[PDB]
Coordinates of C-alpha atoms and ligand atoms in Angstrom, one line a residue:
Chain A
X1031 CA -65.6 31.8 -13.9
X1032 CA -66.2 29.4 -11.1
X1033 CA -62.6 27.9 -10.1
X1034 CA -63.2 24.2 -9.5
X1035 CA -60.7 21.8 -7.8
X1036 CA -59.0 19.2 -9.8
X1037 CA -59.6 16.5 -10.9
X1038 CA -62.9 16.8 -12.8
X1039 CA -65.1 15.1 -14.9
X1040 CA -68.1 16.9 -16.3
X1041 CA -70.0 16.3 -19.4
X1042 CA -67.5 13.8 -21.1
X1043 CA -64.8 15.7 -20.0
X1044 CA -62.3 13.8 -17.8
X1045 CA -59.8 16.6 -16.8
X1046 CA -57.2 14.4 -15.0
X1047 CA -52.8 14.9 -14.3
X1048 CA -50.9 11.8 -15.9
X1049 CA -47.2 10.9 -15.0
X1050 CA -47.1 14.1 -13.1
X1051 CA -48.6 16.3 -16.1
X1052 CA -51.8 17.5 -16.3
X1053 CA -54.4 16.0 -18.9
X1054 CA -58.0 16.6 -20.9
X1055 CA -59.8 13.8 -22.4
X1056 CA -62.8 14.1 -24.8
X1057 CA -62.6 10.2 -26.3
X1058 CA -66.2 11.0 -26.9
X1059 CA -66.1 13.6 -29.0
X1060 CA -62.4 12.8 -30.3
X1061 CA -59.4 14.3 -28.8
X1062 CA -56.9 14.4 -25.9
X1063 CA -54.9 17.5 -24.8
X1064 CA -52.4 18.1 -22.0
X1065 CA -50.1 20.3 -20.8
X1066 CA -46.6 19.6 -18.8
X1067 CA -44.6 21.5 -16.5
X1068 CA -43.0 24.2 -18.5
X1069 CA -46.0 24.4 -20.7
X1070 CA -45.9 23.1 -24.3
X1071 CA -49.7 22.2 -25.1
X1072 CA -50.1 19.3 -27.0
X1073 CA -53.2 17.7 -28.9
X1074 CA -54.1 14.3 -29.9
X1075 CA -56.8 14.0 -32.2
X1076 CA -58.7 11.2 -34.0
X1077 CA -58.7 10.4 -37.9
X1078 CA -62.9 11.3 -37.8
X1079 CA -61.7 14.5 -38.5
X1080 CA -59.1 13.8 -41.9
X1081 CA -59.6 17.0 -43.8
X1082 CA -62.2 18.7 -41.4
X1083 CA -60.6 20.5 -38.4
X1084 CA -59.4 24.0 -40.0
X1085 CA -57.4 26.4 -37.4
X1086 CA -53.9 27.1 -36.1
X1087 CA -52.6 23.6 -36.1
X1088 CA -53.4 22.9 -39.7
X1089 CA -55.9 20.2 -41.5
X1090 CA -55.1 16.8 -40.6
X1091 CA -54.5 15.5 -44.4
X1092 CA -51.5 13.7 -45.2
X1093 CA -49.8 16.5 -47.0
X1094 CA -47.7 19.8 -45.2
X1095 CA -47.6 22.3 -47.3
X1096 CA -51.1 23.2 -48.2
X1097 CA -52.0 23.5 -44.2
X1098 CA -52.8 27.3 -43.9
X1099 CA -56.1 27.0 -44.9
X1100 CA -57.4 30.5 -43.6
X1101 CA -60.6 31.3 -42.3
X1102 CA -61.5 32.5 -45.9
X1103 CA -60.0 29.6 -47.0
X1104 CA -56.5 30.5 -48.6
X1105 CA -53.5 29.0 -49.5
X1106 CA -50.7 31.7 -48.4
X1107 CA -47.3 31.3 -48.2
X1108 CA -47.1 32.8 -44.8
X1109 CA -47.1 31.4 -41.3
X1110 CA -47.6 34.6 -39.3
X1111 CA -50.8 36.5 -41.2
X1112 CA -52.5 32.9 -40.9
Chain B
X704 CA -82.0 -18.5 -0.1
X705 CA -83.3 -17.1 -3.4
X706 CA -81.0 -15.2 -6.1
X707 CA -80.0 -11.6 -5.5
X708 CA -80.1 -9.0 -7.9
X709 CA -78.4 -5.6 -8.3
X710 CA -79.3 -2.8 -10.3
X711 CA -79.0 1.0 -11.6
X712 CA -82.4 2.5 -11.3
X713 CA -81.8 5.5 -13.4
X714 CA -78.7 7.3 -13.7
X715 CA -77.2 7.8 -10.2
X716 CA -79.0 5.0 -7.6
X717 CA -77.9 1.5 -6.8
X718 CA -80.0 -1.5 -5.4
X719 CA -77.4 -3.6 -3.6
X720 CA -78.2 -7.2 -2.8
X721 CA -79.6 -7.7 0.1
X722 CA -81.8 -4.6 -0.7
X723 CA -79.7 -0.9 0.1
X724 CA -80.9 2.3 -2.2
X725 CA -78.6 5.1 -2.2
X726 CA -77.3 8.0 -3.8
X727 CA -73.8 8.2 -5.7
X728 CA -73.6 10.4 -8.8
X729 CA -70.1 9.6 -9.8
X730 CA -68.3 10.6 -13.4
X731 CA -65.2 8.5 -13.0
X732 CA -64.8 4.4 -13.8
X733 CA -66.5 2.3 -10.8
X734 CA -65.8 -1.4 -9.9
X735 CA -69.9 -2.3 -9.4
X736 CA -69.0 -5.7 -8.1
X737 CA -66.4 -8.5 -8.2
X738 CA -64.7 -11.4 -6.2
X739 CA -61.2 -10.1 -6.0
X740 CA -61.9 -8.9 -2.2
X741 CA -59.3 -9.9 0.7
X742 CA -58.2 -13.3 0.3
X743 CA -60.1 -14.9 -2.4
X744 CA -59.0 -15.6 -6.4
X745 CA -60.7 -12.9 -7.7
X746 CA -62.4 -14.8 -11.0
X747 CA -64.6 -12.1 -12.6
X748 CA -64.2 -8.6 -12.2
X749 CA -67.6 -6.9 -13.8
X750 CA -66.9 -2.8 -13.9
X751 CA -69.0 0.1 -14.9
X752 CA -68.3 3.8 -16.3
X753 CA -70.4 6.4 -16.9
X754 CA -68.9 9.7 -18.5
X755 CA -71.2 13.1 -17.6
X756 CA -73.6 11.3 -15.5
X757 CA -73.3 13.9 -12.0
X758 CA -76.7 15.7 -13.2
X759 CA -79.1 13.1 -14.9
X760 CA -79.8 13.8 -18.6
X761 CA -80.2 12.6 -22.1
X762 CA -76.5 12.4 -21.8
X763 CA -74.8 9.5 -19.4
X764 CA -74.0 6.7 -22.2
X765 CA -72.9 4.0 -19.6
X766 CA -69.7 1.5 -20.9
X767 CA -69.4 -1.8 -19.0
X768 CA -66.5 -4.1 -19.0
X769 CA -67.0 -7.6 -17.7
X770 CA -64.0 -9.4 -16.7
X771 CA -63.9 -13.0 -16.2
X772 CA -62.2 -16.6 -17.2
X773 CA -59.3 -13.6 -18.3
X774 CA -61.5 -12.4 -20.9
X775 CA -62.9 -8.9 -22.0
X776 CA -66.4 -8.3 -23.4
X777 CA -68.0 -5.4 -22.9
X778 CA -71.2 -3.0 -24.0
X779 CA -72.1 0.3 -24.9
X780 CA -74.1 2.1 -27.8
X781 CA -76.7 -0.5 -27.9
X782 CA -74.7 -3.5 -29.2
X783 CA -71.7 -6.3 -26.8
X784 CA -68.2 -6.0 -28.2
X785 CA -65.5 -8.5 -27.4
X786 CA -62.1 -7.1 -27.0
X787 CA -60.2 -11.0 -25.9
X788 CA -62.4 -14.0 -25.8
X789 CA -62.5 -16.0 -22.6
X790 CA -60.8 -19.5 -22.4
X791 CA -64.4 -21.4 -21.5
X792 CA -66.5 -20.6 -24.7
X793 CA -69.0 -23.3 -23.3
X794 CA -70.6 -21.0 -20.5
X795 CA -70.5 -18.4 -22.5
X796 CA -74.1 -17.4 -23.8
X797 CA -76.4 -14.3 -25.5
X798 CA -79.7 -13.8 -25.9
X799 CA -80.9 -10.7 -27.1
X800 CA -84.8 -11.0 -26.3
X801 CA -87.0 -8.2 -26.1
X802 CA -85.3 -4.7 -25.0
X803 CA -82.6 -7.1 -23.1
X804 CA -79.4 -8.2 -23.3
X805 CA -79.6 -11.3 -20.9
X806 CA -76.1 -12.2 -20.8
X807 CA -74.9 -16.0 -18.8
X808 CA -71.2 -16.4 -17.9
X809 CA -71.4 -19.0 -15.7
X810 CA -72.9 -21.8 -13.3
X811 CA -73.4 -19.1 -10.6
X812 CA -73.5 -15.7 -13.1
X813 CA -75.8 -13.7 -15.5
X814 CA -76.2 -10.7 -16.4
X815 CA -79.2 -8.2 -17.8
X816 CA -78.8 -4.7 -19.8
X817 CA -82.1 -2.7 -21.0
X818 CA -79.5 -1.1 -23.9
X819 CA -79.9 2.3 -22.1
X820 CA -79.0 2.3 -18.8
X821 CA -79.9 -0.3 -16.4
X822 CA -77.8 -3.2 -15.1
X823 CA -78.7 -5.7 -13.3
X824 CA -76.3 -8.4 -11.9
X825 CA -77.8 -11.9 -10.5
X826 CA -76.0 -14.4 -8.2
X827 CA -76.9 -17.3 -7.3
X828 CA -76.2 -19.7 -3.4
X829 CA -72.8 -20.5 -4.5
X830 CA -70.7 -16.8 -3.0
X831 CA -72.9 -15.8 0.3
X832 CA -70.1 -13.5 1.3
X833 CA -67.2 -14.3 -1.4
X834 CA -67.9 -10.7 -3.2
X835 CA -67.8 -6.9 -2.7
X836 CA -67.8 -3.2 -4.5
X837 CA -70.3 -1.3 -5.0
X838 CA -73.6 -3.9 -4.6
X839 CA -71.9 -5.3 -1.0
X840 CA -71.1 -8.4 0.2
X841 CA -74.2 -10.9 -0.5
X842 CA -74.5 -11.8 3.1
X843 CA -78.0 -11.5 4.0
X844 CA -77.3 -8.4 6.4
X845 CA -78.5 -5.1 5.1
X846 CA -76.3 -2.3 7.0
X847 CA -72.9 -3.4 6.1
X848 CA -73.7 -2.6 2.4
X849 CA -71.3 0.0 2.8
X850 CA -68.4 -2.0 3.7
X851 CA -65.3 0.7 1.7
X852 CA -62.5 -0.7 -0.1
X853 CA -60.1 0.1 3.1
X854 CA -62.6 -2.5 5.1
X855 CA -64.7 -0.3 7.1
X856 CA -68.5 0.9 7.2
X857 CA -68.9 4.1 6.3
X858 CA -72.0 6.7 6.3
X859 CA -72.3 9.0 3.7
X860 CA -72.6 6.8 0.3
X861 CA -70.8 9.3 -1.6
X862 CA -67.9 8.9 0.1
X863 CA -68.3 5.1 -0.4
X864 CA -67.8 5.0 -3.8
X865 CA -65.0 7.3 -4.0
X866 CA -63.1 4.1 -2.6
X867 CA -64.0 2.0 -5.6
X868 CA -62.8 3.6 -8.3
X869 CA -60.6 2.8 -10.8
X870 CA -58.1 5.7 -12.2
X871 CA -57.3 6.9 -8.1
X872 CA -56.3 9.8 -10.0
X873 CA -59.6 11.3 -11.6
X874 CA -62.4 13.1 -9.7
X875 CA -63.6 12.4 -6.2
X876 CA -67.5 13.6 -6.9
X877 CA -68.4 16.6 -4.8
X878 CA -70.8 16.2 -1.7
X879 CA -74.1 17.9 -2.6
X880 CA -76.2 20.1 -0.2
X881 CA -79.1 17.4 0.4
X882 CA -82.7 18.7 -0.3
X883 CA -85.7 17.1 -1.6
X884 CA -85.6 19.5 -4.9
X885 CA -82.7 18.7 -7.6
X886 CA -80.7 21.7 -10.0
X887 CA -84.0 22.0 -11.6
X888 CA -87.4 21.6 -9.6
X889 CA -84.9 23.5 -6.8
X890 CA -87.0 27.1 -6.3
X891 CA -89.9 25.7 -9.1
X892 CA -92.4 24.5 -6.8
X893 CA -94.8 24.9 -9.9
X894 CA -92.9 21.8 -11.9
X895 CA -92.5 19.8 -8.8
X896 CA -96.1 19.0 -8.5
X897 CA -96.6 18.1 -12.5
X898 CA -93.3 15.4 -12.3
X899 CA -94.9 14.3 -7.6
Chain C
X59 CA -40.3 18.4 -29.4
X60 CA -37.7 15.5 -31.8
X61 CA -38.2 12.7 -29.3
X62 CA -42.1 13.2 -29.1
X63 CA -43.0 13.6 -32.7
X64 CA -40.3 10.2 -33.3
X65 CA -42.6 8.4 -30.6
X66 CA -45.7 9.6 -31.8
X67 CA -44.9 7.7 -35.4
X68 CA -45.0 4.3 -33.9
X69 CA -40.7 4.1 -33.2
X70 CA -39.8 5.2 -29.9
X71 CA -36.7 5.9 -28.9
X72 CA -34.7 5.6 -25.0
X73 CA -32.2 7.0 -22.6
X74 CA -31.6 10.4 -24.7
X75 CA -31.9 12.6 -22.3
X76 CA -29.2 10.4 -20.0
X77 CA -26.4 12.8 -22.1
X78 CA -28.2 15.4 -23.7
X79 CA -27.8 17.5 -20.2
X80 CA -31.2 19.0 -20.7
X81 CA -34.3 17.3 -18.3
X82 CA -37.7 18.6 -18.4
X83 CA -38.9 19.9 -15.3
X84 CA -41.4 17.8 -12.8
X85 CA -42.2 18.5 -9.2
X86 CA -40.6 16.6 -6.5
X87 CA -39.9 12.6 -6.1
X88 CA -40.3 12.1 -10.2
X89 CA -38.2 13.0 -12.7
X90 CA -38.3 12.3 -16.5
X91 CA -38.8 8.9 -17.3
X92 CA -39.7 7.4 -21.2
X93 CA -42.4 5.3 -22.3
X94 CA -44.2 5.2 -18.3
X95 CA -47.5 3.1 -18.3
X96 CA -50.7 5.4 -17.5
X97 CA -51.5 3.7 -15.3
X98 CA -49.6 4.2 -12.5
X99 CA -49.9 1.2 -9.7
X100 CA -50.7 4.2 -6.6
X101 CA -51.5 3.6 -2.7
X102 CA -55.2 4.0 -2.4
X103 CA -55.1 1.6 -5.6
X104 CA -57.7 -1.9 -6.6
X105 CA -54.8 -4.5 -7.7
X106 CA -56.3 -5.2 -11.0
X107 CA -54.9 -5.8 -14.5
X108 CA -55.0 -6.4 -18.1
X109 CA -57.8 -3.8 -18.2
X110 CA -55.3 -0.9 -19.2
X111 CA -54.1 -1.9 -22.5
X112 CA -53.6 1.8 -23.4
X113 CA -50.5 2.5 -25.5
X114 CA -47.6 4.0 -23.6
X115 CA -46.8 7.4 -23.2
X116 CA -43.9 9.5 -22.1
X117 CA -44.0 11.6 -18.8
X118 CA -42.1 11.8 -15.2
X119 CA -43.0 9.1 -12.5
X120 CA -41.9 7.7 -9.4
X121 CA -39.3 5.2 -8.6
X122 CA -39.1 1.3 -8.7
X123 CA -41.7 1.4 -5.2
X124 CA -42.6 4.5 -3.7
X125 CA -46.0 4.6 -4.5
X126 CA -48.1 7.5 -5.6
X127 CA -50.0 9.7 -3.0
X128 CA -51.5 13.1 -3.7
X129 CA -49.2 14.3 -5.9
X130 CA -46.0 12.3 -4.1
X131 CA -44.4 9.8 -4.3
X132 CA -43.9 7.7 -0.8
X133 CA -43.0 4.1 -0.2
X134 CA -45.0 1.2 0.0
X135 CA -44.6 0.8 3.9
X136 CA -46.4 3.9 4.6
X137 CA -50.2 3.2 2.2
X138 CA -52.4 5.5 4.9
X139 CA -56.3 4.5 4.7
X140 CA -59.3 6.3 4.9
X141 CA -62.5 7.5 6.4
Ligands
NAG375 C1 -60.3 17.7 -48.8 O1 -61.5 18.5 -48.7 C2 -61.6 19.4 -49.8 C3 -62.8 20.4 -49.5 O2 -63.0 20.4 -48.1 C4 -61.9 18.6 -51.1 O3 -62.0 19.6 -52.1 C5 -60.7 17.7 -51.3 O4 -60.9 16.8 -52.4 C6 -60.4 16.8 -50.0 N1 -59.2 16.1 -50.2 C7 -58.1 16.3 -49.5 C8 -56.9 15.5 -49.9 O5 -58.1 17.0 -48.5
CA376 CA1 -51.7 19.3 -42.8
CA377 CA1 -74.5 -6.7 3.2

């Protein structure tokens, strides 16, 4: 709850702005988001995780339609209820 | 004159040459030393980085990257990798002895690594005053140790090494409240006197 | 979102926002460049090289000079120092 000023780097957790756009690196533990000026998040993500990481942006496997993997674990044919 | 010697004691000190302890607890990429400094060739280019190193801890897995005769070798997680081999394979030289990494790049060069933390630089006669970064300058005098990047001596250590980092665009470390109690033995006089 | 996920397979593509009327938004002194090294040569900057061998990503930055400065860009003339 503590707002910080920016940049930051705690605990392998470079929190940075590149080419004018802000930036959050974890090469540690495996991924790198950021954010630009409108807002349109974006994730970049290792292959340590092929088949692991379950959630809104779908299991990084090669195939596209069995990503909605619910928290139960089920294949539905809806994009919303997920 | 004898051969100087840097080193990390711990996670967040530095020993410069001619003998200068002092406190930087930095998170970003640091140049520890190199040659490249005013109007000189700038051979070798050694570089350290530590990532969540502000508050000492288990955590703090240094990387070092070494740069010289245009190559790239560099260390971390116990074992040397070599990303471009240099041109002069002949000075070139390992010896993994003990807990050690002693590490030779040159004539006038070497290099020691305990495979957790500590490094520890060693020059020889040949620069007295070619060098700067984080260790100094290498001349003998004691004071100007803290000669910043924009070639002035400056005070307050923290704001030394601010100036010699890398990405100018990640995180100026934040100038701590000094008292003789870190986050921890800070209000547990009890624990202070098992670790004094 | 077409550009990025085209860049992101390992074929980039150039200049199609030169037509397309449409450029995302950036603050002041920078607008939307393509394929922009990371590591952005600023002011307060160590001239060293072949360290940043990152692959290249998209994003808004300066002009040909006019060198980075807290959050601006300002030519080369004017580098302040420090103390
Ligand atoms: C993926 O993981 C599941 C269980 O997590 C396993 O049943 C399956 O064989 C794996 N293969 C693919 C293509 O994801
Ligand atoms: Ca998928
Ligand atoms: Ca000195």
């Amino acid at each position: 709850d503590q707002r910080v000023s920016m940049p930051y780097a705690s605990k392998g957790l470079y929190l940075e702005t590149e080419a004018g756009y802000y930036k959050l690196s974890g090469e540690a533990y495996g991924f790198v988001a950021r954010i630009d000026g409108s807002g349109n998040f974006q994730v970049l993500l290792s292959d340590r995780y092929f088949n692991k990481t379950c959630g809104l942006c779908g299991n990084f496997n090669i195939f596209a339609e069995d990503d909605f993997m619910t928290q139960e674990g089920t294949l539905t044919s809806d994009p919303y209820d997920f | 004159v004898c051969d100087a010697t840097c080193s990390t004691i711990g996670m967040a000190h530095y020993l410069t040459f001619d003998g200068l302890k002092y406190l930087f607890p930095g998170e970003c990429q640091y140049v520890l030393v190199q040659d490249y400094c005013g109007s000189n060739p700038g051979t070798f280019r050694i570089l350290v980085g530590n990532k969540g190193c502000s508050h000492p801890s288990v955590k703090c897995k240094k990387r070092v990257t070494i740069l010289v005769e245009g190559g790239e070798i560099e260390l971390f997680d116990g074992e040397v990798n070599v990303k471009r081999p240099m041109k002069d394979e002949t000075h070139f030289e390992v010896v993994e002895s003990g807990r050690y990494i002693i590490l030779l790049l040159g004539k006038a060069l070497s290099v020691v690594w305990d495979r957790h933390l500590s490094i520890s630089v060693v020059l020889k006669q040949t620069y007295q005053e070619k060098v700067c970064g984080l260790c100094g300058n290498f001349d003998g005098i004691q004071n100007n140790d803290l000669t910043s990047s924009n070639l002035q001596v400056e005070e307050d250590p923290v704001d030394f090494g601010n100036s010699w980092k890398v990405s100018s665009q990640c995180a100026d470390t934040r100038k701590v409240p000094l008292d003789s109690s870190p986050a921890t033995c800070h209000n547990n006089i009890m624990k202070q006197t098992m670790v004094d | 979102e077409y550009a990025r996920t085209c860049a992101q397979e390992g074929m980039v593509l150039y200049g199609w926002t030169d037509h397309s009327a449409c450029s995302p938004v950036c603050p002041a002194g920078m607008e939307y460049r393509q394929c922009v090294s990371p590591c952005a040569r600023t002011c307060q900057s160590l001239h060293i090289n072949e360290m940043c061998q990152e692959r290249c990503v998209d994003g808004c930055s300066c002009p040909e000079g006019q060198l980075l400065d807290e959050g601006l860009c300002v030519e080369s003339t004017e580098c302040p120092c420090v103390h």
